[PDB]
Enzyme design. Sequence first.
Site, mmCIF file in Angstrom:
data_model
loop_
_atom_site.group_PDB
_atom_site.id
_atom_site.type_symbol
_atom_site.label_atom_id
_atom_site.label_comp_id
_atom_site.label_asym_id
_atom_site.label_seq_id
_atom_site.Cartn_x
_atom_site.Cartn_y
_atom_site.Cartn_z
ATOM 1 N N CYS A 1 35.991 8.316 -24.499
ATOM 2 C CA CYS A 1 36.327 8.963 -25.762
ATOM 3 C C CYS A 1 36.411 10.479 -25.600
ATOM 4 O O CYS A 1 37.332 11.109 -26.110
ATOM 5 C CB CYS A 1 35.322 8.620 -26.864
ATOM 6 N N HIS B 1 27.670 15.811 -30.048
ATOM 7 C CA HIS B 1 28.079 14.417 -30.055
ATOM 8 C C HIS B 1 27.152 13.596 -30.927
ATOM 9 O O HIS B 1 25.935 13.746 -30.882
ATOM 10 C CB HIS B 1 28.099 13.905 -28.607
#
Lengths: 335, 338, 338, 335
Positions: C157, C184
Amino acid sequence: TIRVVINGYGRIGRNILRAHYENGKKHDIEIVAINDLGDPKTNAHLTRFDTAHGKFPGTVTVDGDYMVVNGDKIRVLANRNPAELPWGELGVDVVLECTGFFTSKEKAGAHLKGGAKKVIISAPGGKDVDATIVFGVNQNVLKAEHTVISNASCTTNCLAPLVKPLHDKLGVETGLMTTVHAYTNDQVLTDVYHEDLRRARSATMSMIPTKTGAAAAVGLVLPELNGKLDGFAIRVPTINVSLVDLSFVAKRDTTVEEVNSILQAAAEGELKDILTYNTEPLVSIDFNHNPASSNFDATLTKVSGKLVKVSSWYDNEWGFSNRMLDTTVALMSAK
Amino acid sequence: HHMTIRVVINGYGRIGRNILRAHYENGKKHDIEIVAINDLGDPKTNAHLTRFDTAHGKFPGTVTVDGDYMVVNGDKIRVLANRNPAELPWGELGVDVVLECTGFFTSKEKAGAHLKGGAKKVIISAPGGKDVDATIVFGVNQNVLKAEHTVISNASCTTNCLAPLVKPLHDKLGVETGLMTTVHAYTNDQVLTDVYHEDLRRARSATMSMIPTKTGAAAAVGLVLPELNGKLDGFAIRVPTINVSLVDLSFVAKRDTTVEEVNSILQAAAEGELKDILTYNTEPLVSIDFNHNPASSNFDATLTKVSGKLVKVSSWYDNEWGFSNRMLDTTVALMSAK
Amino acid sequence: HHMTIRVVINGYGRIGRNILRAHYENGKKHDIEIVAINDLGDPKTNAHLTRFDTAHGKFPGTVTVDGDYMVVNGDKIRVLANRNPAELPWGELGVDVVLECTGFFTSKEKAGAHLKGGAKKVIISAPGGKDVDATIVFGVNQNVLKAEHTVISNASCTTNCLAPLVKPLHDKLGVETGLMTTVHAYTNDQVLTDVYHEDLRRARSATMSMIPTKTGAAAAVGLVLPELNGKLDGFAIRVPTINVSLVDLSFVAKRDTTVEEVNSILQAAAEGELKDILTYNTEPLVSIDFNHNPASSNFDATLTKVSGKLVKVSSWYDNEWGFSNRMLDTTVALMSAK
Amino acid sequence: TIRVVINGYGRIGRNILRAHYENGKKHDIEIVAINDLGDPKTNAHLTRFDTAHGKFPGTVTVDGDYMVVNGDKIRVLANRNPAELPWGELGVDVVLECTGFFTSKEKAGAHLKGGAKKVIISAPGGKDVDATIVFGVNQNVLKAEHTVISNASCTTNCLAPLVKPLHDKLGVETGLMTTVHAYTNDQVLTDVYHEDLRRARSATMSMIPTKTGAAAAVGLVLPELNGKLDGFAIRVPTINVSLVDLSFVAKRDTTVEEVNSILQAAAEGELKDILTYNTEPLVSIDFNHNPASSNFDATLTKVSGKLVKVSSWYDNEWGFSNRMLDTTVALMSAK
Ligand SMILES: [Mg+2]
Ligand SMILES: [Mg+2]
Ligand SMILES: [Mg+2]
Ligand SMILES: [Mg+2]
Ligand SMILES: [Mg+2]
Ligand SMILES: [Mg+2]
C-alpha cells in the site's frame, strides 16, 4: 407543504438538514432558511464533510444570500435575537430551535414574535412547554393550539419506544436505566475547566458518569410511568451511537422469548421504522447512520424472576434528526 | 524475604507480569518471593515489557537479564520455557505455590501436572473447572480455605468486584434476583480492526465500538456466596478504554430501602470487614482515577439509584491491578490455612 | 460477466475481503469474476465479516452461505479450506489468477504451488521475494508486464502511494536522495494493550501511542522506478487511527524549485497520465475524508513545503482500499499483457 | 528567592505549579498567588486529578483566600484586568502569563502596571517581545532590562535543542520539519464550528494538519538558522506526547553514528537534562511526564547522502512547564 427554518446550524441543525435530503425529501417540508451566527461557507463545508456521518451524498453550494442544497435555495440569516428574525415576512411555519439557548417555552417564544407560527425545541424543554413528543409514542397529544414543543432527547426517544410495548403487554412496576453513551461536544479532549467536574475530564480516556433526565422524562411521554424510572449515563470514548440498558421489575412472570416477541410485534406494528428488532451479532458502529429511534437488540435480553433487562442501540444524532422531521409534520397536522 | 512463601508464575502474559509488578510495587508487602517464571517467550522481551507498560506506566525499579535469570530489584528470578508443567523443576526450586496464568490449565486435572513437577499448591488466575478445590474472592470467603486444598481458583476480576459489593447488601437487605452489566475496558482477546475471531462480536474493532460479550462472572458469585447461587446473571459491554471497568448491578431487594440506606451499608462494610478490598467513594471521579488502584471493588456512592425495590449499585475496578494484588493475598491465605 | 477473468482469493483476511468488497462496490467495473475463496475459517464467520466492517461500513449488497458457496449479489463463490495450494482445485475451476493474500507464499517458489494446482498466474498482495517476475505499481510501471510473467507482486500500500507521488517529480526536477515518514494507521499486526510481540515497539498498545516501525516501502520504489534505486529510504510512525495513512516525503531536488512549481507538476500528472491513481487536493481536508477513497495517492497540495533544494510533499492514502482496487487493476493488466 | 504568580490557571498554569512541587521545589521560587477567573475549588480538584499526568502526589486544600499546596499558602485572585491585580502590593517578581490572551509585549505589559516586575508569556510572543527563550539554548540573551519575554512553544523547545548541536558540529543548510503532535483543547471531539476548518474536525478519528510557527521561530532562538527551516504539524489521536521529525540537508557528508554521537555528547554536556539521548525501543507514552525539552531517539536516525532525518519525542506539556521554571530563574538572574 410545510415551510421550515433551522435556528442554530450546529450539529443538530446540520443533521436535520442532511436527514431531509438523504431520505429523498420523503416529508412534505421545504427548509426555506437557516439562521446561524457562523459564516455560511464554514457551515456549508461542515455539511459536505462529517466525521461521524461521512460525506453528504448531495450537493451544497453558497450563492449570495443562499445555501443551495440539491437545487433548493435556502436563505441564510445571522440574527442573534430571534424576535428580529424575518420569519413572518418569510412565511415560516415551524422553527426548528437547535441552538440550545432557547429551551423554555418563554425564551423559545421569541420566534413567534418574529412571525413564525410554531417552534420545536431540539432538546428537552422547560416545565412550561406545550408538549414533549417522542414521535411514534405520543404524537397524538399534539393540538393545533400548541406553539412551542420539545422533541425530548435522543435518549428519551430510544427509551420510550422500548418501554411502551413492554408496559402495555407485560407491565413495568419500576425500572432503572444506564445509558452507555457516545461522547458529545459538551465534553473535552484533555482535562479543562468545566461547570461539571466529571465532564471536565478527558472524554477519550475514561468512562464518565453524567446525569440524565431521560428516565424521568419518559413519565411526561407515558404518564403511567411517572416516577417509576430512574437512571444515569456513562459517557465512553466513542464518537457516535449509544446504548440504553434498562433493568425493570415486570408485573408478572415472563421469559426471554416472550419479552423479545413483544418487541418484535411492536417493531412490525405501530412502532414500525421507529423501533427496530435485531437478532444479528452486531456492535455499536453497525447502527451508525441508522435513522431509527430505538434499535432493540434481542440478543441481549435477560430475565431472572420478575427482573428483566432489555437493551437498545440508537444513533443519538441521526435517529433524533429524522424524528424532528416526523414531529414537524405531525405538529402542522394537529387539529 | 526469609523463610518465605516461594512462588512461581506459569505464563508471563499480562496477568503474570502484573502479579510480579504488584508484588514489587508495594515493596514485597507480602512475605512472598517470586523465584521463577515459565514462559515460551524470549526472556529479554519479557524483561522489556516488565520495565515499560502503557496502562501501568514504567516499573519503579530495575530489571535485567543475567544468564538464566531475570533480576528484579536485585532478586534473581529463574527463567524457564517448557510447555509441560510435569517437566518443570518445581521440586528442585522448592516451590510452594504456582500462580497458573496461562489459561491452559484451569482444571484440577490439568493443573495437577504442576504438583507432579513438585509444587505444593496451584492458584489458577481465572475461573476454574468444576473439580477445583475452592474458588476464592479474598475478603469474602478466604475462610473456606483448608490445608488440604491444593488447586484453587482466584475467580475473575469481575467476580472479585461484584462479590464484595453484593455481600453486605445481601446480608442486610436480602437479594431476590439481580442482573449485572459490566462496562468493561477492552482486552487482548479483542482486535484493533475487524478480523476473524471465534466470537463474531469480538471480531470487530474494539477501538470504535461498544461490543457485547458473555461473562459468567455474575453467576460465579454463587461459588463464593452460596446463598446467591442461581440468583445473579449478567453480561459485559466492552468499550474503548485500555483499563478500568465498571460493575453496574441491578437487583431486587427483599425489603424496601433507599439510596442513603444502601450507601450506608456499603460505607460500613468498607470501613470494617471489607477494608482495603471494598472502598467507598463520594468524589466526582472518572474511570482513569481508579487506574492502578489495588482495591477489588471501588464502590461509587454517587451513582446509587433506588426505584421501588429495585436497586442499582456501581463499582469501579482496575480489572488488572486489583486482581493481581488479590492473587498475592490469596497465596498467603492458602499457605496459612490450617 | 461473460468470457471473463476468473480470479480466486487465497486468504480471506482483511486484504482478501477488501478486494472482494472493492470488486462488488464499484459494480464489478473490472471484467473479473471471483469464483472461489480459500481460507481456514468458518465460512459463516467470513460471510458476516463481509457484510459488516468497522472501517468500510456495511457492504451495499447481499451475502449468504448456501452449501459449499458464499453467494454475493447472486454470484456463487466456492468456499475452500486447504493449507497446501498444490492441492487446491484451480485447474478444475479454470482459474486465471490467484490473488495470494495469506502472507505465507510471497516467493515465486512458494506461490508456484498455485500453478501446480492449475492456476495460470499469481499476484501476491504484498512485496515479493527476489525471484518474482515483476513488482507492479499500477499507473507507474504496468507496461513492464509480459505474457510470460506468472508470479508477480503488487508491491505494498505504501509503495503504491509513494511511487505515483515521486515519479512526476523525478521526471521534471530530478531526485538526488529522499527520506520518507509514513504516518500510518494501526493494523492488526499491532495490539490493544501491551503483550508479547516479535517487535518490542509493536508489542505496545497501538491505541495510546505513536509507534515507530520499519518499512521497506521507500527502498522498494527502486523495483518499480529503477532510476530511483538506492535513493530513497524511510520508516513508519503508527498512530491511533483505524485506517488512512499519510506519506510524508522529504527529498533533495537536482534543481531549484518552489512550492507552486512542485504543486503544478503534480497537478498535471493527476490530470494526465496518473489520472484516478494520483489525485490532487487543495481543500482543507483531514484523514477520514480519504477513507474508502480508491486512489493510490491523494496528494495534498496544501502541505507542500520547499526550503532551498529540500522539498516536502505529502499524500493521503486509504492503506486498505486503494491497494484493494489496484489488485483488480493489476489483474486486468497481467491478463492483457502480450 | 523569586516570588512568582500564575496568571491563568488552565492546563499550562496547573502543570507549572505541579512541576514546581513534584521536583521538590528545586528552584528558588515561591508561587505566592494564582489569578484565574474560575472558582478555586474546581481548579484545586483539577490540580489533584489529571488524566494525562495522573494524580498529584502532594496535597492540595482550599482555605479561605488561599489554595494550600504542600503547606504553601498561595493567594487566589480573580481579576480579569491585569493592571488592577495587586501585584505590586504583593511583591510579585515574575508573572507567568498563561491565559493565551496577552501574548504581545503590549497586552502582557498590563501586569507591569499592576506592580509586577516581569512577565513570561507561556507561548510564542508578538514580534514585539523583549526576548524569546528556549532554556538551555539561548537563555544567555536575557538582560536585566527585559520585562516581557516569551518562553517560545513546546515544539520550539523540542526542535531548538535538537538542531543547535547539529548546526554547530555538522551544519544545517536547510531543513523541513513535521511534528506529529498530540491533540490539544483547541481541537474538538466531534465536528463543530471552528475558525480553522481542519481543527473543526474530530481530533479523535483523524490525522489533522495544522500550521506551526516552530520551524521559523527557531530562527529567533538561533539567528544563524533564520529562514532555513519550515514545516507543519499533524495532530493525531493521542492525549499527550509529541514527535519532532526533522529532515535537513547537512553541509558535509556524515553518517548515522556520527549524527547520533553529536547528540549524545550534547546530552551529556551543555544540554544535560534539557536534551536526552535514547537508544531503547520505546514509544510515545514512555515519554509521558518526562521533564526534558527534547528526547532524541537515536534509533530513528537516517542518513541518505547529505540528507539527514532526526526525531525527538517531547512531553508537550510537562517539558515546557518545567522550562517555565528554569526561565523564571534565569530572567531574575540576568544582569
Ligand atoms: Mg514464609
Ligand atoms: Mg521434574
Ligand atoms: Mg487441618
Ligand atoms: Mg474476460
Ligand atoms: Mg489438484
Ligand atoms: Mg509475447
